Protein backbone atom coordinates (compact mmCIF):
# COMPACT_ATOMS: atom_id res chain seq x y z
CA UNK A 1 0.00 0.00 0.00
CA UNK A 2 2.97 2.35 -0.45
CA UNK A 3 3.18 5.26 -3.05
CA UNK A 4 -0.64 5.48 -3.32
CA UNK A 5 -1.59 1.78 -3.43
CA UNK A 6 -4.20 0.30 -1.02
CA UNK A 7 -4.88 -3.13 0.40
CA UNK A 8 -8.50 -4.18 -0.27
CA UNK A 9 -10.20 -6.97 1.69
CA UNK A 10 -11.00 -9.85 -0.80
CA UNK A 11 -13.53 -11.34 1.75
CA UNK A 12 -15.53 -8.07 1.68
CA UNK A 13 -15.21 -7.92 -2.19
CA UNK A 14 -16.76 -11.43 -2.46
CA UNK A 15 -19.66 -9.97 -0.39
CA UNK A 16 -20.22 -7.10 -2.91
CA UNK A 17 -17.90 -4.24 -1.90
CA UNK A 18 -17.39 -1.89 -4.94
CA UNK A 19 -18.97 -4.33 -7.41
CA UNK A 20 -20.32 -2.54 -10.54
CA UNK A 21 -22.32 -3.13 -13.74
CA UNK A 22 -20.82 -2.06 -17.09
CA UNK A 23 -22.90 -1.38 -20.18
CA UNK A 24 -21.85 -0.62 -23.81
CA UNK A 25 -24.32 0.22 -26.65
CA UNK A 26 -23.25 -0.78 -30.17
CA UNK A 27 -25.16 0.86 -33.06
CA UNK A 28 -25.91 0.42 -36.84
CA UNK A 29 -28.41 1.60 -39.55
CA UNK A 30 -29.37 -0.03 -42.87
CA UNK A 31 -27.55 2.07 -45.59
CA UNK A 32 -27.52 5.92 -46.34
CA UNK A 33 -28.09 6.24 -50.18
CA UNK A 34 -29.21 4.12 -53.15
CA UNK A 35 -32.88 3.01 -53.68
CA UNK A 36 -31.32 -0.04 -55.45
CA UNK A 37 -28.10 -0.16 -53.26
CA UNK A 38 -29.57 -0.87 -49.74
CA UNK A 39 -27.53 -2.64 -46.98
CA UNK A 40 -29.10 -5.61 -45.13
CA UNK A 41 -29.24 -6.88 -41.50
CA UNK A 42 -28.67 -10.65 -41.80
CA UNK A 43 -26.50 -13.57 -40.63
CA UNK A 44 -24.17 -13.73 -43.69
CA UNK A 45 -22.45 -16.76 -45.27
CA UNK A 46 -20.12 -17.64 -48.30
CA UNK A 47 -22.20 -16.01 -51.14
CA UNK A 48 -18.98 -14.92 -53.13
CA UNK A 49 -18.63 -12.29 -50.18
CA UNK A 50 -15.77 -13.74 -47.98
CA UNK A 51 -14.93 -10.15 -46.66
CA UNK A 52 -16.04 -11.44 -43.19
CA UNK A 53 -14.36 -10.71 -39.85
CA UNK A 54 -14.50 -14.23 -38.27
CA UNK A 55 -14.98 -13.53 -35.30
CA UNK A 56 -17.74 -16.23 -35.40
CA UNK A 57 -21.16 -15.06 -36.61
CA UNK A 58 -22.53 -18.27 -34.99
CA UNK A 59 -24.19 -16.39 -32.06
CA UNK A 60 -26.40 -14.33 -34.45
CA UNK A 61 -30.01 -15.15 -35.29
CA UNK A 62 -31.44 -15.04 -38.90
CA UNK A 63 -31.90 -11.21 -38.53
CA UNK A 64 -28.13 -10.64 -37.97
CA UNK A 65 -28.73 -9.84 -34.27
CA UNK A 66 -27.62 -11.60 -31.07
CA UNK A 67 -30.47 -12.54 -28.71
CA UNK A 68 -30.30 -10.84 -25.29
CA UNK A 69 -28.98 -13.43 -22.89
CA UNK A 70 -26.13 -14.92 -24.96
CA UNK A 71 -22.58 -14.54 -23.62
CA UNK A 72 -20.24 -12.50 -25.80
CA UNK A 73 -16.44 -12.13 -25.87
CA UNK A 74 -13.42 -10.99 -27.88
CA UNK A 75 -14.41 -10.44 -31.52
CA UNK A 76 -17.83 -12.24 -31.57
CA UNK A 77 -19.91 -10.55 -34.34
CA UNK A 78 -22.72 -8.79 -32.39
CA UNK A 79 -24.45 -7.27 -35.48
CA UNK A 80 -24.39 -8.82 -38.95
CA UNK A 81 -24.73 -6.47 -41.89
CA UNK A 82 -23.94 -6.78 -45.62
CA UNK A 83 -23.17 -4.30 -48.41
CA UNK A 84 -24.36 -5.15 -51.96
CA UNK A 85 -21.26 -4.47 -54.16
CA UNK A 86 -21.82 -6.02 -57.66
CA UNK A 87 -22.60 -10.34 -54.38
CA UNK A 88 -22.51 -9.10 -50.68
CA UNK A 89 -19.56 -7.53 -48.75
CA UNK A 90 -19.20 -7.57 -44.95
CA UNK A 91 -20.36 -4.59 -42.76
CA UNK A 92 -20.72 -6.57 -39.50
CA UNK A 93 -19.90 -5.10 -36.05
CA UNK A 94 -17.61 -7.24 -33.84
CA UNK A 95 -17.62 -6.74 -30.05
CA UNK A 96 -14.60 -4.69 -28.76
CA UNK A 97 -11.63 -7.19 -28.96
CA UNK A 98 -10.83 -6.36 -25.29
CA UNK A 99 -14.40 -6.72 -23.94
CA UNK A 100 -16.64 -9.71 -23.01
CA UNK A 101 -20.12 -9.87 -21.37
CA UNK A 102 -23.77 -10.88 -21.73
CA UNK A 103 -26.04 -9.36 -24.38
CA UNK A 104 -28.30 -7.18 -22.21
CA UNK A 105 -30.92 -5.62 -24.52
CA UNK A 106 -31.37 -5.30 -28.36
CA UNK A 107 -33.57 -2.44 -29.63
CA UNK A 108 -34.85 -2.94 -33.19
CA UNK A 109 -36.31 0.40 -34.27
CA UNK A 110 -36.62 2.82 -37.17
CA UNK A 111 -34.99 6.20 -38.02
CA UNK A 112 -36.84 9.33 -39.32
CA UNK A 113 -35.63 8.43 -42.85
CA UNK A 114 -37.49 5.07 -42.64
CA UNK A 115 -34.20 3.31 -41.85
CA UNK A 116 -33.96 -0.10 -40.11
CA UNK A 117 -31.57 0.68 -37.22
CA UNK A 118 -30.40 -1.21 -34.14
CA UNK A 119 -28.80 -0.63 -30.68
CA UNK A 120 -27.10 -3.57 -28.90
CA UNK A 121 -26.47 -3.21 -25.14
CA UNK A 122 -23.88 -5.63 -23.62
CA UNK A 123 -23.68 -6.05 -19.76
CA UNK A 124 -20.50 -6.90 -17.74
CA UNK A 125 -20.12 -7.09 -13.98
CA UNK A 126 -16.75 -5.69 -12.88
CA UNK A 127 -15.40 -6.98 -9.51
CA UNK A 128 -12.61 -4.85 -7.75
CA UNK A 129 -9.32 -6.26 -9.11
CA UNK A 130 -5.64 -5.24 -8.65
CA UNK A 131 -4.79 -1.95 -10.53
CA UNK A 132 -8.41 -0.69 -10.25
CA UNK A 133 -8.48 3.06 -9.07
CA UNK A 134 -10.36 4.20 -5.93
Amino acid sequence: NQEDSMIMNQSSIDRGLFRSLFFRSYMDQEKKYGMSITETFEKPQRTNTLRMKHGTYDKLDDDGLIAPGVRVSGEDVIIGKTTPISSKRDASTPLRSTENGIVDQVLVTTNQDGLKFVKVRVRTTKIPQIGDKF
Partner: protein, 266 residues
Protein backbone atom coordinates in the same frame (compact mmCIF):
# COMPACT_ATOMS: atom_id res chain seq x y z
CA UNK B 1 -8.66 -32.69 30.76
CA UNK B 2 -4.95 -31.85 30.05
CA UNK B 3 -3.90 -29.12 27.61
CA UNK B 4 -6.17 -26.24 26.54
CA UNK B 5 -9.04 -25.24 28.90
CA UNK B 6 -12.50 -23.69 28.12
CA UNK B 7 -14.91 -21.61 30.27
CA UNK B 8 -18.14 -20.62 28.53
CA UNK B 9 -19.21 -17.21 29.90
CA UNK B 10 -22.39 -16.96 27.80
CA UNK B 11 -23.88 -19.08 25.01
CA UNK B 12 -26.85 -18.78 22.63
CA UNK B 13 -28.17 -20.37 19.39
CA UNK B 14 -25.96 -17.95 17.33
CA UNK B 15 -23.21 -16.78 19.80
CA UNK B 16 -20.62 -18.32 22.27
CA UNK B 17 -18.60 -16.24 24.71
CA UNK B 18 -15.80 -18.22 26.23
CA UNK B 19 -12.40 -17.97 27.82
CA UNK B 20 -9.77 -20.18 26.23
CA UNK B 21 -7.09 -20.61 28.92
CA UNK B 22 -3.85 -22.72 28.96
CA UNK B 23 -3.07 -22.02 25.30
CA UNK B 24 -0.48 -20.88 22.80
CA UNK B 25 -1.21 -17.67 20.87
CA UNK B 26 -0.25 -19.62 17.70
CA UNK B 27 -3.04 -22.14 18.55
CA UNK B 28 -5.74 -19.57 19.57
CA UNK B 29 -5.05 -17.58 16.38
CA UNK B 30 -4.78 -20.63 14.05
CA UNK B 31 -8.13 -21.70 15.53
CA UNK B 32 -9.61 -18.11 14.97
CA UNK B 33 -8.29 -18.26 11.32
CA UNK B 34 -9.62 -21.79 10.58
CA UNK B 35 -13.08 -20.81 11.95
CA UNK B 36 -13.23 -17.84 9.54
CA UNK B 37 -11.84 -19.60 6.39
CA UNK B 38 -11.80 -23.38 6.38
CA UNK B 39 -14.91 -25.02 7.89
CA UNK B 40 -16.87 -26.54 4.87
CA UNK B 41 -20.32 -25.13 4.16
CA UNK B 42 -23.09 -25.46 1.50
CA UNK B 43 -23.85 -22.42 -0.64
CA UNK B 44 -25.40 -21.84 -4.12
CA UNK B 45 -22.54 -22.04 -6.64
CA UNK B 46 -24.53 -22.27 -9.87
CA UNK B 47 -27.63 -20.44 -11.17
CA UNK B 48 -29.38 -21.12 -14.47
CA UNK B 49 -31.77 -18.22 -15.24
CA UNK B 50 -34.82 -19.33 -17.28
CA UNK B 51 -36.69 -15.99 -16.85
CA UNK B 52 -35.81 -12.60 -15.33
CA UNK B 53 -38.11 -9.63 -15.98
CA UNK B 54 -37.00 -7.92 -12.77
CA UNK B 55 -35.19 -4.57 -12.51
CA UNK B 56 -32.13 -6.51 -11.16
CA UNK B 57 -29.41 -8.06 -13.41
CA UNK B 58 -28.97 -11.82 -13.89
CA UNK B 59 -25.60 -11.97 -12.09
CA UNK B 60 -26.61 -9.27 -9.52
CA UNK B 61 -29.35 -11.76 -8.38
CA UNK B 62 -27.12 -14.91 -8.79
CA UNK B 63 -24.49 -13.14 -6.60
CA UNK B 64 -27.01 -12.55 -3.76
CA UNK B 65 -28.26 -16.17 -4.08
CA UNK B 66 -24.77 -17.43 -3.13
CA UNK B 67 -24.90 -15.24 -0.07
CA UNK B 68 -28.14 -16.86 1.23
CA UNK B 69 -27.25 -19.07 4.21
CA UNK B 70 -28.32 -22.79 3.69
CA UNK B 71 -28.45 -25.65 6.26
CA UNK B 72 -24.92 -27.08 6.62
CA UNK B 73 -25.49 -29.40 9.68
CA UNK B 74 -24.87 -32.74 7.90
CA UNK B 75 -22.22 -31.32 5.51
CA UNK B 76 -19.42 -33.91 5.87
CA UNK B 77 -21.90 -36.48 4.42
CA UNK B 78 -21.99 -34.53 1.14
CA UNK B 79 -19.02 -34.74 -1.29
CA UNK B 80 -17.08 -31.94 -2.95
CA UNK B 81 -18.25 -32.12 -6.61
CA UNK B 82 -14.53 -32.10 -7.67
CA UNK B 83 -14.13 -35.56 -5.91
CA UNK B 84 -17.53 -36.90 -6.97
CA UNK B 85 -17.32 -39.44 -9.78
CA UNK B 86 -20.49 -38.03 -11.44
CA UNK B 87 -20.39 -35.99 -14.61
CA UNK B 88 -20.95 -32.50 -13.18
CA UNK B 89 -23.23 -32.76 -10.12
CA UNK B 90 -25.69 -35.11 -8.33
CA UNK B 91 -27.33 -35.90 -4.95
CA UNK B 92 -23.99 -37.24 -3.57
CA UNK B 93 -22.30 -33.83 -4.05
CA UNK B 94 -24.95 -31.08 -4.56
CA UNK B 95 -28.36 -29.68 -3.57
CA UNK B 96 -30.81 -28.29 -6.18
CA UNK B 97 -33.10 -25.36 -5.25
CA UNK B 98 -35.79 -23.73 -7.37
CA UNK B 99 -37.01 -20.16 -7.49
CA UNK B 100 -40.26 -19.38 -9.28
CA UNK B 101 -41.85 -16.00 -8.48
CA UNK B 102 -44.47 -13.82 -10.26
CA UNK B 103 -45.93 -10.38 -9.52
CA UNK B 104 -49.55 -11.37 -9.02
CA UNK B 105 -50.68 -8.28 -7.04
CA UNK B 106 -50.64 -4.57 -7.95
CA UNK B 107 -48.75 -4.17 -4.62
CA UNK B 108 -44.98 -4.96 -4.63
CA UNK B 109 -44.32 -8.73 -4.55
CA UNK B 110 -41.31 -9.55 -2.34
CA UNK B 111 -39.08 -12.58 -3.00
CA UNK B 112 -37.54 -14.34 0.05
CA UNK B 113 -35.24 -17.28 0.82
CA UNK B 114 -38.39 -19.06 2.11
CA UNK B 115 -39.45 -19.08 -1.60
CA UNK B 116 -36.41 -21.25 -2.64
CA UNK B 117 -37.51 -24.86 -3.00
CA UNK B 118 -35.34 -28.03 -2.69
CA UNK B 119 -35.94 -30.23 -5.75
CA UNK B 120 -32.90 -32.59 -5.12
CA UNK B 121 -33.08 -35.83 -3.09
CA UNK B 122 -31.47 -35.01 0.30
CA UNK B 123 -31.22 -38.74 1.30
CA UNK B 124 -32.21 -37.80 4.88
CA UNK B 125 -29.37 -35.28 5.45
CA UNK B 126 -30.01 -31.92 7.28
CA UNK B 127 -28.71 -29.86 4.35
CA UNK B 128 -29.93 -27.15 1.89
CA UNK B 129 -32.93 -25.75 3.84
CA UNK B 130 -32.50 -21.93 3.63
CA UNK B 131 -31.57 -20.53 7.05
CA UNK B 132 -34.55 -18.54 8.40
CA UNK B 133 -34.01 -16.39 11.57
CA UNK B 134 -36.45 -13.47 11.06
CA UNK B 135 -39.64 -13.36 13.26
CA UNK B 136 -41.91 -13.27 10.13
CA UNK B 137 -40.32 -16.49 8.79
CA UNK B 138 -39.39 -14.95 5.42
CA UNK B 139 -35.59 -14.63 5.87
CA UNK B 140 -33.55 -12.65 3.26
CA UNK B 141 -35.15 -10.47 0.66
CA UNK B 142 -33.67 -11.82 -2.62
CA UNK B 143 -35.79 -9.59 -4.87
CA UNK B 144 -38.82 -7.30 -5.44
CA UNK B 145 -41.39 -7.58 -8.27
CA UNK B 146 -43.96 -5.28 -9.93
CA UNK B 147 -47.07 -6.64 -11.72
CA UNK B 148 -45.98 -8.39 -14.95
CA UNK B 149 -42.67 -9.30 -13.30
CA UNK B 150 -41.38 -12.84 -13.27
CA UNK B 151 -38.31 -14.72 -12.12
CA UNK B 152 -37.60 -18.35 -12.93
CA UNK B 153 -34.23 -19.91 -11.97
CA UNK B 154 -32.52 -23.11 -10.76
CA UNK B 155 -29.83 -23.31 -8.05
CA UNK B 156 -27.05 -25.91 -7.66
CA UNK B 157 -25.72 -25.49 -4.11
CA UNK B 158 -22.27 -27.04 -3.54
CA UNK B 159 -19.77 -27.74 -0.70
CA UNK B 160 -16.95 -25.19 -0.32
CA UNK B 161 -14.86 -23.05 2.12
CA UNK B 162 -14.55 -19.27 2.75
CA UNK B 163 -10.91 -19.44 1.47
CA UNK B 164 -12.52 -19.89 -2.08
CA UNK B 165 -15.47 -17.51 -1.58
CA UNK B 166 -16.70 -15.58 1.53
CA UNK B 167 -20.23 -16.92 0.90
CA UNK B 168 -18.94 -20.26 2.42
CA UNK B 169 -18.15 -18.62 5.79
CA UNK B 170 -20.14 -20.32 8.61
CA UNK B 171 -19.15 -17.43 10.96
CA UNK B 172 -19.27 -13.65 11.03
CA UNK B 173 -17.06 -11.78 13.49
CA UNK B 174 -14.81 -13.50 15.97
CA UNK B 175 -14.01 -11.39 18.98
CA UNK B 176 -10.45 -11.93 20.22
CA UNK B 177 -8.53 -10.33 23.15
CA UNK B 178 -5.67 -11.43 25.44
CA UNK B 179 -4.15 -9.50 28.43
CA UNK B 180 -6.70 -6.63 28.81
CA UNK B 181 -4.25 -4.78 31.15
CA UNK B 182 -1.22 -4.73 28.75
CA UNK B 183 0.84 -6.31 31.64
CA UNK B 184 2.68 -8.05 28.77
CA UNK B 185 3.41 -4.65 27.12
CA UNK B 186 2.40 -6.15 23.69
CA UNK B 187 1.06 -2.72 22.67
CA UNK B 188 2.40 0.79 23.31
CA UNK B 189 -0.50 3.17 24.07
CA UNK B 190 -0.67 6.43 22.15
CA UNK B 191 -1.58 9.37 24.38
CA UNK B 192 -1.93 13.11 25.03
CA UNK B 193 -1.96 13.21 28.90
CA UNK B 194 -2.93 9.85 30.52
CA UNK B 195 -3.17 6.55 28.49
CA UNK B 196 -5.23 5.09 31.45
CA UNK B 197 -7.81 7.90 31.34
CA UNK B 198 -7.64 8.03 27.48
CA UNK B 199 -8.09 4.30 26.70
CA UNK B 200 -11.36 2.61 27.71
CA UNK B 201 -10.74 -0.60 29.68
CA UNK B 202 -12.06 -3.99 28.44
CA UNK B 203 -15.01 -5.86 30.06
CA UNK B 204 -12.28 -8.54 30.30
CA UNK B 205 -10.39 -6.53 32.96
CA UNK B 206 -12.97 -7.85 35.54
CA UNK B 207 -11.60 -11.38 34.86
CA UNK B 208 -7.95 -10.44 35.63
CA UNK B 209 -5.96 -8.82 38.47
CA UNK B 210 -4.66 -5.28 37.62
CA UNK B 211 -0.86 -4.85 37.01
CA UNK B 212 0.07 -3.25 40.39
CA UNK B 213 2.50 -0.29 39.69
CA UNK B 214 4.97 -1.25 42.46
CA UNK B 215 6.07 -4.39 40.58
CA UNK B 216 8.80 -4.76 37.90
CA UNK B 217 7.87 -5.81 34.35
CA UNK B 218 7.33 -9.62 34.10
CA UNK B 219 9.70 -10.27 31.14
CA UNK B 220 9.28 -14.10 31.28
CA UNK B 221 5.38 -13.99 31.12
CA UNK B 222 3.68 -15.37 28.03
CA UNK B 223 0.20 -14.83 26.53
CA UNK B 224 -1.99 -17.76 27.78
CA UNK B 225 -5.80 -17.02 28.34
CA UNK B 226 -7.82 -15.74 25.33
CA UNK B 227 -11.22 -13.97 25.65
CA UNK B 228 -13.24 -15.00 22.57
CA UNK B 229 -16.74 -14.68 21.14
CA UNK B 230 -17.67 -16.68 18.03
CA UNK B 231 -20.76 -15.57 16.00
CA UNK B 232 -22.55 -17.94 13.64
CA UNK B 233 -24.14 -16.80 10.37
CA UNK B 234 -26.68 -19.67 10.81
CA UNK B 235 -25.68 -22.58 8.45
CA UNK B 236 -23.98 -24.46 11.32
CA UNK B 237 -24.77 -23.99 15.09
CA UNK B 238 -22.26 -22.04 17.30
CA UNK B 239 -20.95 -25.11 19.16
CA UNK B 240 -20.17 -26.63 15.70
CA UNK B 241 -18.22 -23.57 14.39
CA UNK B 242 -15.64 -24.18 17.21
CA UNK B 243 -15.85 -28.00 17.27
CA UNK B 244 -15.48 -28.18 13.44
CA UNK B 245 -12.91 -25.37 13.64
CA UNK B 246 -10.85 -27.57 16.06
CA UNK B 247 -11.49 -30.76 14.01
CA UNK B 248 -10.49 -29.03 10.68
CA UNK B 249 -7.20 -27.67 12.13
CA UNK B 250 -6.58 -31.05 13.87
CA UNK B 251 -7.29 -32.69 10.43
CA UNK B 252 -4.95 -30.41 8.47
CA UNK B 253 -2.10 -31.15 10.95
CA UNK B 254 -2.75 -34.91 10.53
CA UNK B 255 -2.40 -34.50 6.70
CA UNK B 256 1.18 -33.16 7.23
CA UNK B 257 1.96 -36.12 9.56
CA UNK B 258 0.60 -38.44 6.85
CA UNK B 259 2.51 -36.56 4.08
CA UNK B 260 5.81 -37.34 5.96
CA UNK B 261 4.81 -41.05 5.93
CA UNK B 262 4.06 -41.09 2.15
CA UNK B 263 7.38 -39.46 1.19
CA UNK B 264 9.12 -41.97 3.46
CA UNK B 265 9.24 -44.90 0.99
CA UNK B 266 11.20 -44.30 -2.31
Amino acid sequence: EEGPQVKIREASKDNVDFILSNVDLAMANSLRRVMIAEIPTLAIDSVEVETNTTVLADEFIAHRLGLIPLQSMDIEQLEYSRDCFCEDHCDKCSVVLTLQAFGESESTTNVYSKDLVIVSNLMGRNIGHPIIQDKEGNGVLICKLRKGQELKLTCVAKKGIAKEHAKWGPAAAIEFEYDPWNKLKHTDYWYEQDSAKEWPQSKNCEYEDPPNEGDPFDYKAQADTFYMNVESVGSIPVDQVVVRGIDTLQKKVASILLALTQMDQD
